[PDB]
Symmetry: C2
Subunit: 221 residues, 2 copies
Amino acid sequence: KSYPSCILPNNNRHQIFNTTQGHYDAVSFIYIPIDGGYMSGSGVVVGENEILTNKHVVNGAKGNPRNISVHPSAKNENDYPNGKFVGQEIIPYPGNSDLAILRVSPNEHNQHIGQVVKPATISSNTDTRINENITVTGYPGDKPLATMWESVGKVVYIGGEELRYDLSTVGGNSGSPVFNGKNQVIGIHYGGVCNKYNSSVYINDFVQQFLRNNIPDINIQ
Amino acid sequence: KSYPSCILPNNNRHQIFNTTQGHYDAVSFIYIPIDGGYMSGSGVVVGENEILTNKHVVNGAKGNPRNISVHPSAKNENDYPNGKFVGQEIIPYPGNSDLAILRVSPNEHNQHIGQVVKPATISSNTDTRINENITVTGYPGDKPLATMWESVGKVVYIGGEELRYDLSTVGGNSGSPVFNGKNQVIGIHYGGVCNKYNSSVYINDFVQQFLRNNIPDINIQ
């Protein structure tokens, strides 16, 4: 058992039904069979064949990326509007943050994940500040499996590779994109300190280089 | 489900039976009831009423330290030579590392945790280097519940608040002390990247200040 992230006083969450509309389509559901059961998590499409998520999420594959299923725009357990893409290569962030790139294979129709949905825009994070209104959108495990939920709140802390917020998340949210009001990705949710705050990997200048060094078509605004 | 840390090519582990001997007595087993079941982890006694462990371990208490049971020197499920101490106050590291101090209450005999075992010695980490021989000792969840195991290996990376090693650990090891050859604590295990390495919070100068600011009798050698 585990409890990676926290229900906070601010528990303002609603389900996304039109999961392929707008910036939602790159939000991705992750499913990994392990020990006869499954682990699930979240991620975000950022390139032709790439998502971002947590190191501790891809770890569930026990070193083999082909154990990971990525469903971009998952709507529920029996509604994957874009099907699945199978993990191909795990590229951990060399720094100390809980961040990994997962490269995925094209699907059975030779479609690439970044063709069926719009890859997310990465923020340059030059305007990102404390008390900014943000959302964290992904697949919390206290809801029905593979339903997408947006959680609303504010940035309470920015420092180094860490950005913290006052909004609620639940095991399953691991790897969820953090969006600013312009729907750009400022961070990748990884955890929290209960019940004080939840935490994300802040996409600072050094993280951005890692993205640039590995994802040629990354879109940093 | 989760898989926080990794079996690596180096899987050199043995069970500690004399758990109160020497530097082993401060190694601690953590038990947290959650969602009708339980979460378990590891930690290390470092002061009269204090252990170190991970932020993501204490999170299992959902904000209430009294949900946490700490058994220093636990030997097996029916052998707690020092009984249990109940969580009293959670003090997260303000920095970005997966590190928390858990203050515990005295036991039913008014004994303090740092009186029944010798608090561990914290290394100054001025000699700690890559390729140094180390151990990580705690309660891996693939062994019988609350049995103590020492894992042997080498440091492969030191940077910022992160120290990585080539030795194997398993879910349950979260919060385990990392010992150098002088049996001083150089880090606190928190995770890994499968199957490349496992990771700990490196007790650098800034972490040491946090320890000093909160634990008056901390012993930094």
